[PDB]
Design a protein around this ligand. Sequence first.
Ligand SMILES: CCC1=C(C)/C(=C/C2=NC(=C\c3[nH]c(/C=C4\NC(=O)[C@H](C)[C@H]4CC)c(C)c3CCC(=O)O)/C(CCC(=O)O)=C2C)NC1=O
Ligand SMILES: CCC1=C(C)/C(=C/C2=NC(=C\c3[nH]c(/C=C4\NC(=O)[C@H](C)[C@H]4CC)c(C)c3CCC(=O)O)/C(CCC(=O)O)=C2C)NC1=O
Ligand SMILES: CCC1=C(C)/C(=C/C2=NC(=C\c3[nH]c(/C=C4\NC(=O)[C@H](C)[C@H]4CC)c(C)c3CCC(=O)O)/C(CCC(=O)O)=C2C)NC1=O
Ligand SMILES: CCC1=C(C)/C(=C/C2=NC(=C\c3[nH]c(/C=C4\NC(=O)[C@H](C)[C@H]4CC)c(C)c3CCC(=O)O)/C(CCC(=O)O)=C2C)NC1=O
Ligand SMILES: CCC1=C(C)/C(=C/C2=NC(=C\c3[nH]c(/C=C4\NC(=O)[C@H](C)[C@H]4CC)c(C)c3CCC(=O)O)/C(CCC(=O)O)=C2C)NC1=O
Ligand SMILES: CCC1=C(C)/C(=C/C2=NC(=C\c3[nH]c(/C=C4\NC(=O)[C@H](C)[C@H]4CC)c(C)c3CCC(=O)O)/C(CCC(=O)O)=C2C)NC1=O
Ligand SMILES: CCC1=C(C)/C(=C/C2=NC(=C\c3[nH]c(/C=C4\NC(=O)[C@H](C)[C@H]4CC)c(C)c3CCC(=O)O)/C(CCC(=O)O)=C2C)NC1=O
Ligand SMILES: CCC1=C(C)/C(=C/C2=NC(=C\c3[nH]c(/C=C4\NC(=O)[C@H](C)[C@H]4CC)c(C)c3CCC(=O)O)/C(CCC(=O)O)=C2C)NC1=O
Ligand SMILES: CCC1=C(C)/C(=C/C2=NC(=C\c3[nH]c(/C=C4\NC(=O)[C@H](C)[C@H]4CC)c(C)c3CCC(=O)O)/C(CCC(=O)O)=C2C)NC1=O
Ligand SMILES: CCC1=C(C)/C(=C/C2=NC(=C\c3[nH]c(/C=C4\NC(=O)[C@H](C)[C@H]4CC)c(C)c3CCC(=O)O)/C(CCC(=O)O)=C2C)NC1=O
Ligand SMILES: CCC1=C(C)/C(=C/C2=NC(=C\c3[nH]c(/C=C4\NC(=O)[C@H](C)[C@H]4CC)c(C)c3CCC(=O)O)/C(CCC(=O)O)=C2C)NC1=O
Ligand SMILES: CCC1=C(C)/C(=C/C2=NC(=C\c3[nH]c(/C=C4\NC(=O)[C@H](C)[C@H]4CC)c(C)c3CCC(=O)O)/C(CCC(=O)O)=C2C)NC1=O
Ligand SMILES: CCC1=C(C)/C(=C/C2=NC(=C\c3[nH]c(/C=C4\NC(=O)[C@H](C)[C@H]4CC)c(C)c3CCC(=O)O)/C(CCC(=O)O)=C2C)NC1=O
Lengths: 101, 172, 172, 172, 172, 50, 162, 162, 162, 163
Amino acid sequence: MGLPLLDTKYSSKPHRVASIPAVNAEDKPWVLDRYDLRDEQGLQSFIFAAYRQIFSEHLILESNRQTELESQLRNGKLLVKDFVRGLGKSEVFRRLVLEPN
Amino acid sequence: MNDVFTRAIAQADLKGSFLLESDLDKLASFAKEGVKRLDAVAALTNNAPAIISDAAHKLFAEQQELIQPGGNAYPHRRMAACLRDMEIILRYVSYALLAGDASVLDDRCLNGLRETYNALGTPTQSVARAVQLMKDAAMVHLKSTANVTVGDCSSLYSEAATYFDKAAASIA
Amino acid sequence: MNDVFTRAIAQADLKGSFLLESDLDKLASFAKEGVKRLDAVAALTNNAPAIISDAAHKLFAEQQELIQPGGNAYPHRRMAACLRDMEIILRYVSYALLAGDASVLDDRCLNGLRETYNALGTPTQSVARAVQLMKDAAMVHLKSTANVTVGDCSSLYSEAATYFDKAAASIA
Amino acid sequence: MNDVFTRAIAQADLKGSFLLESDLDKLASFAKEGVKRLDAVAALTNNAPAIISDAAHKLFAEQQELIQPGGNAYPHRRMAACLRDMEIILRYVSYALLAGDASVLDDRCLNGLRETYNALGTPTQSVARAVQLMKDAAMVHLKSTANVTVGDCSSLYSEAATYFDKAAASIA
Amino acid sequence: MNDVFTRAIAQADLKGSFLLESDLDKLASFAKEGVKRLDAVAALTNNAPAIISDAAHKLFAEQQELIQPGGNAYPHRRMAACLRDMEIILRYVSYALLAGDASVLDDRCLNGLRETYNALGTPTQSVARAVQLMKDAAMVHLKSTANVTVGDCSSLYSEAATYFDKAAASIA
Amino acid sequence: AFGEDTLPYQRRPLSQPFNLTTPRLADIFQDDQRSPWERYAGPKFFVGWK
Amino acid sequence: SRTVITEVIATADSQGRFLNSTELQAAFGRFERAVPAIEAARALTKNQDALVKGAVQAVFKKFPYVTQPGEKGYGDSNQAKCARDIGYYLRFITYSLVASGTGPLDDYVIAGLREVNRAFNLNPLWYIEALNYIKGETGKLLSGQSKTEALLYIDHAINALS
Amino acid sequence: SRTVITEVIATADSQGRFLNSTELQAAFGRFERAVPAIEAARALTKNQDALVKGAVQAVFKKFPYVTQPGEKGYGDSNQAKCARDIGYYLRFITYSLVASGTGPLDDYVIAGLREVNRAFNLNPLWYIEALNYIKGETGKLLSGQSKTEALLYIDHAINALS
Amino acid sequence: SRTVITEVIATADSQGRFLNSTELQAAFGRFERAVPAIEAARALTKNQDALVKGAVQAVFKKFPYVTQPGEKGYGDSNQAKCARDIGYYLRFITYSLVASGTGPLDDYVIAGLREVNRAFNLNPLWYIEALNYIKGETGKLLSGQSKTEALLYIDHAINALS
Amino acid sequence: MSRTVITEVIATADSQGRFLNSTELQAAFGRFERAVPAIEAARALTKNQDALVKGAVQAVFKKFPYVTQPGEKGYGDSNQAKCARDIGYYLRFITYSLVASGTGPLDDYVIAGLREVNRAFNLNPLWYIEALNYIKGETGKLLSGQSKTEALLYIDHAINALS
Ligand SMILES: CCC1=C(C)/C(=C/C2=NC(=C\c3[nH]c(/C=C4\NC(=O)[C@H](C)[C@H]4CC)c(C)c3CCC(=O)O)/C(CCC(=O)O)=C2C)NC1=O
Ligand SMILES: CCC1=C(C)/C(=C/C2=NC(=C\c3[nH]c(/C=C4\NC(=O)[C@H](C)[C@H]4CC)c(C)c3CCC(=O)O)/C(CCC(=O)O)=C2C)NC1=O
Ligand SMILES: CCC1=C(C)/C(=C/C2=NC(=C\c3[nH]c(/C=C4\NC(=O)[C@H](C)[C@H]4CC)c(C)c3CCC(=O)O)/C(CCC(=O)O)=C2C)NC1=O
Ligand SMILES: CCC1=C(C)/C(=C/C2=NC(=C\c3[nH]c(/C=C4\NC(=O)[C@H](C)[C@H]4CC)c(C)c3CCC(=O)O)/C(CCC(=O)O)=C2C)NC1=O
Ligand SMILES: CCC1=C(C)/C(=C/C2=NC(=C\c3[nH]c(/C=C4\NC(=O)[C@H](C)[C@H]4CC)c(C)c3CCC(=O)O)/C(CCC(=O)O)=C2C)NC1=O
Ligand SMILES: CCC1=C(C)/C(=C/C2=NC(=C\c3[nH]c(/C=C4\NC(=O)[C@H](C)[C@H]4CC)c(C)c3CCC(=O)O)/C(CCC(=O)O)=C2C)NC1=O
Ligand SMILES: CCC1=C(C)/C(=C/C2=NC(=C\c3[nH]c(/C=C4\NC(=O)[C@H](C)[C@H]4CC)c(C)c3CCC(=O)O)/C(CCC(=O)O)=C2C)NC1=O
Ligand SMILES: CCC1=C(C)/C(=C/C2=NC(=C\c3[nH]c(/C=C4\NC(=O)[C@H](C)[C@H]4CC)c(C)c3CCC(=O)O)/C(CCC(=O)O)=C2C)NC1=O
Ligand SMILES: CCC1=C(C)/C(=C/C2=NC(=C\c3[nH]c(/C=C4\NC(=O)[C@H](C)[C@H]4CC)c(C)c3CCC(=O)O)/C(CCC(=O)O)=C2C)NC1=O
Ligand SMILES: CCC1=C(C)/C(=C/C2=NC(=C\c3[nH]c(/C=C4\NC(=O)[C@H](C)[C@H]4CC)c(C)c3CCC(=O)O)/C(CCC(=O)O)=C2C)NC1=O
Ligand SMILES: CCC1=C(C)/C(=C/C2=NC(=C\c3[nH]c(/C=C4\NC(=O)[C@H](C)[C@H]4CC)c(C)c3CCC(=O)O)/C(CCC(=O)O)=C2C)NC1=O
Ligand SMILES: CCC1=C(C)/C(=C/C2=NC(=C\c3[nH]c(/C=C4\NC(=O)[C@H](C)[C@H]4CC)c(C)c3CCC(=O)O)/C(CCC(=O)O)=C2C)NC1=O
Ligand SMILES: CCC1=C(C)/C(=C/C2=NC(=C\c3[nH]c(/C=C4\NC(=O)[C@H](C)[C@H]4CC)c(C)c3CCC(=O)O)/C(CCC(=O)O)=C2C)NC1=O
């Protein structure tokens, strides 16, 4: 680590104040979880939704497909947090997202 | 996000100087009156639902367009958001009153609230009016002597009015 | 995100009034033509691969500059993204066709698409041309009478045409 | 992120043609002098603490107002941030020296750094001065003939000077 | 998490053959009686809160040691937890009712609930007793034919009894 | 917000999606890409009724 | 607002796919749905006034104390606001009928109901009883599919309130 | 596998909430839809041998090159495997018909289709236009809504092969 | 793209550290291997026309039926696109040789290969046949070590296709 | 932006999205009672600043003789001046922390980034530990009762962070 970080200096955003349910039910993004991983088609949909949330649906290509992470997830040895992190800590995420920006 | 002590220390540090006799005396005075300050912050915290209800009653008495269909507080989820915003602002005023500095109110609450309201379509002068109504309702609770030792609290009333007006003017 | 029924309901609630009997008649007629609408949406669904293939072939026959070294669809990756865009637009068009309201496009697809294409460097007129080619391709499959009860559905053809044109205009 | 070889490849592909024999000869010469390039990169890497310490000592001799109360390097966090920034820029210069192209240095380090320093209130001229001081303290080490085979590393010295000047000109 | 049709297809694939006409006949017999099943499940869903209130009242009545301190059901949050457990097991029985299979019951939670209740220390026979009595309470509502067209309901009652007792026997 | 079990999702009503508004790259020049005013200078490899 | 069509589209978009067979089957179900629901809405829209008056009178009847001075329900303005609120509930039940989904009720009435009731001291049981009276009255007004659909939406509102 | 009832129950339990109206009576829609689908399944189950035998030779008609020696279709055993594959596809179309969803066809056929087809160098167009022939013969065997049902399920299979 | 130098720098930059001795050893290996790789690139660059034409002809020989009417190989335009694509593959093989990494291939060719081939129905086996022809003629054109490098890259392309 | 009693209270109330409960104002009352000995200590410690700094410098030189000879850090008038300036900084921030009734001034202005700066400039933490030990000894005399304990807490915190 090292030094502490700077100050956040918050701002008014919808997520900060959401004690009341959102305006539209369908417009609430789907909350995928561990149970969705128990089925098989549900597991494929979960994997695609993860690739869409991180890689933006245009990088969902067979060359970009992390198969090791997917197999670990399918085992049950991998948390969703760790799957998301492994997608972030991947060569495709560095080369396609970090390098341009 | 500073109390009065931290602003004193930061202003002193910028000049690179110790804290002087007068500054230490002022800060000791602040600590001594912190008892009254805790009474005032408690009077805000205990009575928050009553303050919000009074402000809402008066505000929707005076401005009926808010609650008519096509209004901005009508659809009965916008009413909940109205009352929730009032409670948030009252909470941040109580934070600031405990601290002695309007920093937390300015940064954690009002930083971008104006453009948020403008994008939503919310009438900002009505929101400022609601904040001023909360100020009016809260002053009575602050001035209640029941179960509290009598004393001078004009400075605390002025500070609370300053914080409520700061919130209202930031929104407006 | 609004379909036709929710759009009517939102209008009525803005007026703060019950739905008219005339508007209920309009919604009933919509629900009556719903079977034809489902047939059209299913035609787009089934024929999406052929639609996108035909549109891509014509587009890259017309504009070689896209597929030249340095073009905006030159490598496999950029061409794959191009075809993905065509599929995404066709998919949102089918969504709107089913819902009977173009809110799906404007909300989810076309809200900031032109700014995105400018940021990427994508030729936006070429994207609009691809959308129009997809429209021409999809009209053929929507007109097909095979394996479907014969009838008149010109309102659906005009509806799908205006969603394709809305997508192209918002992009172009 | 590009090096000399990938820069040549990308330009050739934009021209849509194979690499000319002149380009392959240039890249062959680059690879042949690559061992001297590795020597310079290792000299920069192994002497990073020395370079940073000398640059810091010189900079805070020249510009005392940084380390005065109210300066931009006054407390320990700000001094540590200063030294950290110098280490980061030296790191990216060594990357760009190994690669042979300033694309990594400009893309990953200097692309938006002046805006950041302005937003932080940092004197960009002071940062540029620190970068030039690191240039001097580094070329002291690149020219260290001891422990390596003697040879003509003038091209590498010029390349390192250009990278450091590019950093200084970008920040200021 | 399987349906009667899903189970039939699973066995058909296991034997490697197509679906036999007797299996199709029994599926058709199930499907023609679908509105039976839907009315039962929907009435159970609508009247569930009253069922749970009655169940809580009685389980407090016959079983006394829980309500006083020291029992596995004294605290108020523990009351919320117990109400949630009875609600969710009723809901799972509703799921098994609509699906027509107990795999939606056995697999999801009954597997883990065993070791869960063994680790917690709350007696399991009390849980099974509460399951049976809440079954009786819900069955009373399921009898209610008013506001709905009259018909036979014996098979659904038998299936519901089997599923309730299966859940109890698993827990016990 | 999400924990160890839930997959991330945008905490905004999704009528204004993120990935549409934010691309992976915005307003940069690419090496493999070619300026819109430029034209290809290489083998034509065919003449289709030019 | 949530609907059969709208959830179909949301589900299709979440998985980045076109509408498959089951989605269009649900759409067909809602399209056949519409007719009885629209007759239910027409019947409730024709008879809105009698229903509102009956509901307000029943609320006074089973809560005699609120009618008295010093209580919530006393006054001409308060009872006019009661009538307006019951009109709101009936209007949103008709909206849910026409949409063939609980989108309108959840969007307007249900979302934030508890906080508003707690802040304005509006006892939910008044509205629950008014909904029960509306349930009874539409037990006479409607029959068949329409009766079931209207009662279903009124029950949804009742569970949400309670 | 995945079915409409399975979707309803999984969604309802995922939120831990009882079933809402759309779920119940979309299950109603499926219950009604069961009647033509099961007839379609029986009709498809009657004629399976003729359908498979026609499909293999339809493939050979459209794609002759697969038959000459050194290609995949050459040999008796390879054609027997072709017949077995087409029988699999037809059986799963029937399974989807009885299941009212593409579930059995998705988990039993679509799941891992492309990598397996690539590993064994099976050209998907073979299966695509064999399924097209099956669609054409359903064009005569069936009639009415069941017709559409069969067609759309075959649709899905084709949609997944391309 | 992805070379030895670029992987070295990116690995250092992802852990936020200076380039240490192992990274410089890898870079040294690259700089020593640059001579045979540049030799191989020059050899394949000199004879590009013969290689491309022979590869196209080998593709046509392996699959005669494709050049028949109604198939992908018929017409001057389609064969011109054949020659263009083989030229692309050869160009990127030489780019990968010069770069001493499969980065140019992985970025330009392999990224998005399946989607594009399936969208335009391009058989990967055509390209594998052409690359096998290139593999064969590289042995004649190249001797010793440059042959080994070129073969590494052509094999990488082939495995990417198959 | 410091971490003080009042501000930690406000932050833990904000993070939970609730008002200030009893215990928060309760700890705030504790702090406001705390402040009088803290201000007394800060006054008695800012009055004697120059003698304290001078004694600390001389004590560091006495305990570390080797730094004084030519060719070391301590050789030179300028290094003398910067020793005095550093110890003055430490004393000033200790008084700040006393006034604020927290370690925010020390943890933000001195402690954060301490090791990096010491390492880069080859400053030895033991010099400042000896200076702070001398200051501790002297404030043992200068302060009586509560004030002495309050000053010693923060001097000990600085010494612990130096180590
Ligand atoms: C922690 C600091 C913070 C604050 C204070 C804050 C307020 C805030 N209020 C909002 C909406 C709102 N705010 C109001 C309240 C106003 N409308 C009427 O005019 C009333 C008279 C008046 C209340 C005094 C209403 C009705 C909405 C809902 C607008 C909508 O739903 O479209 C929103 C947009 C998101 C949403 O609630 O849907 C924010 C972000 N957010 C923050 O992060
Ligand atoms: C539970 C948290 C907490 C609270 C609430 C608190 C308040 C508090 N107020 C006190 C007296 C007091 N309280 C007040 C404030 C009052 N003067 C006017 O009447 C105003 C209406 C009102 C405030 C707005 C004053 C002025 C004093 C006497 C201080 C003096 O000597 O002037 C005292 C000491 C009296 C005793 O203990 O018998 C306390 C402890 N302390 C706490 O730890
Ligand atoms: C909400 C629905 C949605 C849409 C509509 C959408 C469009 C879209 N297309 C993109 C890329 C692209 N889009 C194209 C399309 C062009 N290529 C040729 O010029 C054609 C004429 C034309 C297509 C017909 C190309 C080539 C790219 C690749 C750019 C790149 O890789 O950087 C991107 C950049 C984000 C990324 O690559 O990760 C977006 C946001 N994205 C969405 O999430
Ligand atoms: C399971 C999925 C599903 C589908 C696909 C579906 C569509 C559907 N289309 C129908 C007839 C029809 N379909 C169409 C539309 C077609 N007419 C052609 O000429 C046009 C090319 C085309 C316009 C898109 C028309 C005009 C009818 C006649 C009945 C009517 O208009 O209401 C019918 C009634 C059967 C009949 O009496 O013929 C259904 C159920 N419903 C479903 O539940
Ligand atoms: C926030 C409070 C703060 C502290 C504590 C601080 C310490 C500090 N002391 C410094 C200089 C120095 N300070 C000393 C102290 C030594 N002098 C000798 O007489 C003694 C044995 C010994 C002290 C006990 C020395 C030798 C240097 C020069 C080191 C160098 O530049 O090489 C520097 C580098 C700035 C410069 O070059 O002038 C820092 C950052 N800076 C701060 O902003
Ligand atoms: C890889 C590209 C990159 C770099 C290099 C970079 C540097 C950088 N310098 C920062 C602050 C700083 N930078 C400096 C250094 C400057 N001020 C001093 O006077 C010197 C004259 C001068 C250095 C030679 C200082 C003192 C700060 C602290 C500002 C503060 O804490 O308020 C910060 C933010 C504060 C933080 O989180 O700690 C960043 C991100 N950011 C990047 O994305
Ligand atoms: C494991 C990491 C690694 C290191 C440490 C390394 C150093 C290194 N430098 C070498 C030659 C050399 N090194 C240099 C560089 C020097 N010229 C001037 O004196 C400068 C002070 C200095 C560079 C700025 C030169 C000029 C040569 C001879 C170049 C040649 O003969 O081709 C050689 C080969 C020995 C030879 O050519 O006879 C090595 C291994 N190479 C590596 O792969
Ligand atoms: C220590 C943890 C704990 C809490 C917090 C608790 C609250 C509680 N009060 C209950 C019943 C009750 N609560 C009340 C009190 C209210 N009802 C009337 O309206 C009065 C006017 C009003 C009093 C001001 C009454 C009278 C009952 C009896 C209802 C019955 O069981 O028949 C029940 C139902 C089960 C039971 O206790 O038999 C609970 C759980 N119970 C606990 O074990
Ligand atoms: C996967 C679906 C699921 C199941 C299967 C489930 C059962 C369940 N009951 C639990 C504890 C409990 N279980 C009970 C119920 C028992 N105690 C008495 O009331 C009765 C004899 C009996 C019920 C008839 C109670 C009261 C607790 C609370 C124990 C505590 O908080 O310490 C726990 C421990 C964690 C928690 O309560 O959140 C689980 C998981 N909960 C679920 O979300
Ligand atoms: C909104 C979702 C939904 C509901 C609630 C629903 C109920 C429902 N069930 C029906 C048929 C029926 N439903 C029943 C079942 C009832 N008979 C009694 O035993 C029980 C109270 C109950 C079974 C537990 C019967 C007996 C029929 C007559 C048709 C038959 O079974 O032959 C009908 C057609 C009315 C008619 O015959 O004209 C409806 C609307 N349908 C729906 O789509
Ligand atoms: C979208 C749907 C919606 C609902 C449900 C709703 C409830 C509602 N009713 C209100 C007025 C009121 N509502 C009542 C209660 C009624 N009057 C009594 O006669 C009856 C016993 C009782 C009804 C059964 C009263 C007394 C008022 C006026 C006083 C007050 O608001 O506290 C108000 C406050 C408006 C104002 O400040 O003037 C709300 C928010 N608002 C909505 O926008
Ligand atoms: C339940 C889902 C399922 C499917 C769909 C399925 C198809 C299937 N067919 C296979 C073999 C085969 N299938 C064919 C048939 C092809 N060649 C020609 O005859 C035809 C034109 C064409 C068929 C339309 C051939 C030639 C093979 C042998 C491939 C080989 O061994 O190289 C294989 C590989 C098994 C093996 O090689 O031992 C599979 C997975 N298997 C399944 O378990
Ligand atoms: C990065 C490198 C790259 C490659 C490799 C590439 C291949 C490629 N070839 C294409 C067309 C084509 N390519 C061929 C190749 C066939 N011709 C003969 O018959 C052979 C059997 C066979 C070649 C061995 C054919 C027939 C087409 C036309 C397909 C169509 O228009 O649908 C297309 C469609 C876009 C267009 O030109 O309109 C692509 C993307 N594109 C690239 O950007």
